[PDB]
């Protein structure tokens with residue numbers, strides 16, 4: 001049939017590595033605001049429309065309303081930023097509110113797993129993801145650990161929601 | 164896209180109710196800090212869901228000037244709105 005598209009939106013606090021994860025997925029290196037990539041996930045060829053959290057100076061009401069209708073959401077925090085983790089519930093609540101749905105495909109992502117200065121324990125994030133009924137992926141945009149896994153798990157979650 | 168019309172709609176000598184109008188941009192949460200004007204005592208900080216437009220601050224002292232500041236964190240855009248602040252004297 002037609003090539004299936006997946007609208008993914010990457011949200012999270014500032015500096016947690018959203019753009020870094022997205023650029024690692026698209027261009028496979030570390031160091032614009034919207035990208036599209038053909039991927040093969042579980043055999044199916046899909047078109048990923050990745051919407052990164054752009055800067056304020058790029059604000060447009062059209063893009064805001066368009067991201068309000070995203071199919072999947074990556075909730076990114078950094079393991080060295082306690083406030084980025086403690087504010088994750090705000091992101092979940094407001095995304096569910098703007099989507100007007102109880103079942104919204106989401107994946108919790110703990111980036112910067114390569115760092116030694118951890119302040120958020122893996123067990124805490126696992127407990128939060130379990131209480132939400134969503135997967136939790138530890139990623140590192142620097143070492144590319146778990147990047148493809150996070151985005152592919154989000155695509156899978158969208159596939160289960162669609163059926 | 165910045166919140167507007169920050170004001171106190173009710174007060175006791177130990178508590179305030181503050182309110183604002185939300186911007187058109189989707190807000191994930193509002194960051195609120197309050198403390199004695201002039202910095203005699205340290206500030207305190209908390210967050211309020213982006214679906215709310217009010218906040219209740221408790222435990223204040225009578226006859227004291229307080230400064231309340233509000234930031235709005237954007238859901239789909241980096242950073243915060245420019246902070247908005249008011250001064251209020253309890254008694």
Ligand SMILES: Nc1nc2c(ncn2[C@@H]2O[C@H](COP(=O)(O)OP(=O)(O)O)[C@@H](O)[C@H]2O)c(=O)[nH]1
Nearest residue numbers: 013014015016017018019020111112140141142
């Ligand atoms: N050590 C480490 N640093 C990272 C990682 N991801 C991003 N960074 C760094 O964190 C800083 C901000 O990352 P950025 O992609 O702008 O995060 P964003 O603001 O949420 O999009 C940059 O200087 C990156 O080099 C990671 O996985 N590990």
Ligand SMILES: OC[C@H]1O[C@H](O)[C@H](O)[C@@H](O)[C@@H]1O
Nearest residue numbers: 080081082083084086119120
């Ligand atoms: O609870 C506030 C916390 O803010 C920051 O995470 C500090 O680094 C930490 O030491 C402190 O406990």
Ligand SMILES: OC[C@H]1O[C@H](O)[C@H](O)[C@@H](O)[C@@H]1O
Nearest residue numbers: 208209210218219220221222
């Ligand atoms: O005093 C202001 C208080 O407002 C709300 O009750 C918050 O739950 C609390 O965190 C904050 O300190």
Ligand SMILES: [Mg+2]
Nearest residue numbers: 018019020053
């Ligand atoms: Mg960024």
